[PDB]
């Protein structure tokens, strides 16, 4: 209702960098809020695409940001009569970024890896890798839970079981309040998908440069399955955390599997041991139900609610015709140990090919009325198709069907305005939470400030 659309602040990265593909608020030890921006096609120092991360200090005028340094040199280690290799070209560093406490976690989902042993190999494959920075100290660590030293032949001999070679670890990412990093890896187990969890503290304390294959004893990966419903499901395309089992001592994970069950799509709510607590099924094949997931209590009862995006949903129209517009499904969490039911509300896009529900951001309480709010992105929405972000305020009944406000892309065609979103943080200290919107296509980020 009260995001100011006139007085925008623009932050810009380099041409072709995809600055804005991912972003988050980051708060330093002093409490000062900056903005971490991912730029997965940033040129490395040798004119090859590696990706990069930028830490932007809050300024009304915006502008350019300093590049948060990471090692972009490939590594080789000849050990145990094997040759371990990392390949950072086209790794897409900054395809996801997430902040927790005084730590920034930026992932490169397409970092490749290989292991050679005489004439055999593991295969050069995108295991992914996350880079961890503690900016105020300079400490760096990495986490790459899918790297292995098993040769190609052994996978063949074991029917490709526990095959983590194509994980793309850090494709999606989230951190719990306690400091557990949870990574989505949709290529896990030959494209079923998997989740990798490890405490940030333990990632830092177990990492040393040059080792490449090491143990994080406290880590916890999801499991492989022979259930064909899961094949090519891309379980971990999106990930979130919340409280859904009533036990405040346990944390629950929310996982998007947008091509689950022959492209029907699904989202799952799991315990931290990866036991399924609930499954929400897709409504329509190829709709990409589970592309985006969001967790926030929208109806003021203190129980987290779930929002799922299906940005290629095709709406029925007159004369048996279908129109790709996207959809978002609101699931309100009921009282007691009851299951999540059917959706309390369906929000459907109105622009053809708009991809409404491509991103969903909790805004916190934008208008301070007691109910939390959300923003939904339609990155090719609006009459012109430049992109649109729509704000929905919470209420006793859940969310409103009519948006309280529409933000139109200030960037040209192709910007993908809204493809990334973050809210729920007060960047200027006026007492109202603000919204950051990425437009990777235009290499920029727009900051909207909430006003009284």
């Amino acid at each position, epitope marked *: 209702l009260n995001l100011d659309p006139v007085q925008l602040t623009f932050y810009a990265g380099p041409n072709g960098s995809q600055f804005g593909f991912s972003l988050d608020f980051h708060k330093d030890s002093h409490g000062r809020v900056a903005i971490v921006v991912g730029a997965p096609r940033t040129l490395g120092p040798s004119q090859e695409e590696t990706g990069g991360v930028f830490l932007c200090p809050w300024r009304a005028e915006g502008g350019q940001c300093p590049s948060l340094l990471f090692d972009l040199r490939d590594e080789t*280690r*000849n*050990v*145990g*009569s094997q040759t371990l290799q990392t390949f950072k070209a086209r790794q897409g560093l900054g395809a996801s970024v997430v902040s927790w406490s005084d730590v920034i976690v930026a992932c490169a989902p397409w970092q490749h890896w290989n292991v050679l042993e005489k004439t055999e190999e593991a295969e050069k494959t995108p295991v992914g890798s996350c880079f961890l920075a503690q900016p105020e100290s300079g400490r760096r660590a990495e986490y790459s839970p899918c790297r292995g*030293n098993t040769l190609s032949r*052994i996978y063949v001999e074991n029917d490709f079981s526990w095959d983590k070679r194509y994980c793309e670890a850090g494709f999606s990412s989230v951190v719990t309040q306690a400091g557990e990093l949870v990574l989505g890896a949709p290529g896990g187990y030959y494209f079923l998908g998997l989740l990798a969890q490890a405490p940030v503290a333990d990632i830092f304390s*177990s*990492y*040393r440069p*040059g*080792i490449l*294959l*090491w*143990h994080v*004893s406290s880590q916890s990966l999801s499991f492989d399955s022979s259930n064909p419903e899961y094949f090519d499901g891309y379980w971990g395309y999106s990930v979130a955390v919340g409280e859904f089992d009533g036990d405040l001592n346990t944390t629950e994970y929310v996982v998007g599997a947008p091509t689950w069950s022959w492209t029907l799509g699904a989202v799952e709510i799991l315990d931290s041991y990866y036991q399924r607590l609930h499954r929400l099924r897709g409504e329509q094949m190829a709709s990409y139900f589970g592309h985006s997931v969001a967790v926030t209590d929208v109806n003021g009862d203190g129980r987290h609610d779930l929002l799922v995006g299906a940005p290629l949903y095709m709406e029925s129209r007159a004369d048996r015709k279908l129109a790709e517009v996207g959809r978002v499904y609101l699931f309100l969490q009921p009282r007691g140990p009851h299951a999540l039911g059917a959706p309390s509300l369906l929000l459907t896009g109105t622009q053809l090919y708009g991809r409404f529900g491509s991103a969903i951001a909790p805004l916190g309480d934008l208008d301070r009325d007691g109910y939390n709010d959300i923003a939904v992105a339609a990155p090719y929405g609006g009459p012109s198709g430049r992109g649109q972000v729509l704000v929905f305020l919470g209420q006793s009944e859940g969310l409103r069907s009519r948006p309280s406000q529409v933000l139109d892309s200030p960037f040209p065609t192709g910007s993908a305005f809204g493809f990334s979103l973050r809210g729920a943080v007060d960047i200027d200290d006026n007492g109202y939470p603000d919204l950051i919107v990425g437009a990777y296509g235009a290499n920029q980020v727009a900051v909207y400030r909430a006003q009284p």
Partner: antibody, heavy 119, light 108 residues
Framework: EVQLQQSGAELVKPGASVKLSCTAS????????VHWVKQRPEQGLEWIGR????????KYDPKFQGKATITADTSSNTAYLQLSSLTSEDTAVYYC????????????WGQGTSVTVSS | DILMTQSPSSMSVSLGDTVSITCHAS??????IGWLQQKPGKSFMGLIY???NLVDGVPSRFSGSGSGADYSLTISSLDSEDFADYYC?????????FGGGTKLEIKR
């Protein structure tokens, strides 16, 4: 606290076999490679082999091929070393070992199991 | 197999001394070297992994150095507890192989 707890001293006859155990405490045996090392006063330290208890795959120094058989059982969190065809050269202290962080390292050691081969 | 030659096999040293044990590999092992300590009648404790990294809990007076085929463990300011045996192990190649060992002995 990571701790490898090995089985007790063995007194065995030549030509017989013996099976030493090493149980994980404060961790799961499948977490890492587990190695077996031999120590003798004069000949020093010799690496025997390793197992990946997650899948049972083993490697051996050819010197011990067909004498040593390393196994593991994740149910009982135990790794085992079996020596067949015992000779006087097998009189030694035997250790199980595992790395701290580095996959390939040799950082944590059991207390040792003494084997004495005698008639 | 890679031959690990350790030197010296013993040294007679005093409390407070700084000492170095060297290890020569028969080929380059690019820091894939560990250092181990065995106190009298005791089992083993790992000191260093991958050339220079201290195992958790190991005192700062221990340090590793070297490259290629030649490495060193230095103990700065010997404690009474440091009079023990020390061994290198390489894991560049299987089979893993060990040094002959160095015994730190008390000078008198």
């Amino acid at each position: 606290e990571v701790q490898l707890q090995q089985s007790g001293a063995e007194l065995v006859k030549p030509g017989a076999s013996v099976k030493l155990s090493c149980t994980a405490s404060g961790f799961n045996i499948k977490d890492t490679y587990v190695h077996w090392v031999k120590q003798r006063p004069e000949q020093g330290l010799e690496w025997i082999g390793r197992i990946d208890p997650a899948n049972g795959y083993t490697k051996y120094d050819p010197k011990f091929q067909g004498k040593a058989t390393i196994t593991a059982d994740t149910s009982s969190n135990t790794a085992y070393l079996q020596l067949s065809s015992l000779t006087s050269e097998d009189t030694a202290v035997y250790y199980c070992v595992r790395p701290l962080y580095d996959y390939y390292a040799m950082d944590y050691w059991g207390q040792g199991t003494s084997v004495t081969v005698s008639s | 197999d890679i031959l690990m030659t350790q030197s010296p096999s013993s040294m007679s040293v005093s409390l407070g001394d700084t000492v170095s044990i060297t290890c020569h590999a028969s080929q380059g092992i690019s820091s894939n070297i560990g250092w181990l300590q065995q106190k009298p009648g005791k089992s083993f404790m790992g000191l260093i992994y991958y050339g220079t990294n201290l195992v958790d809990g190991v005192p700062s007076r221990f340090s590793g150095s070297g490259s290629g085929a030649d490495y060193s463990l230095t103990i700065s300011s010997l404690d009474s507890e440091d009079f023990a045996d020390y061994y290198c192990v390489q894991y560049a190649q299987l089979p893993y192989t060990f040094g002959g060992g160095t015994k730190l002995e008390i000078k008198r």
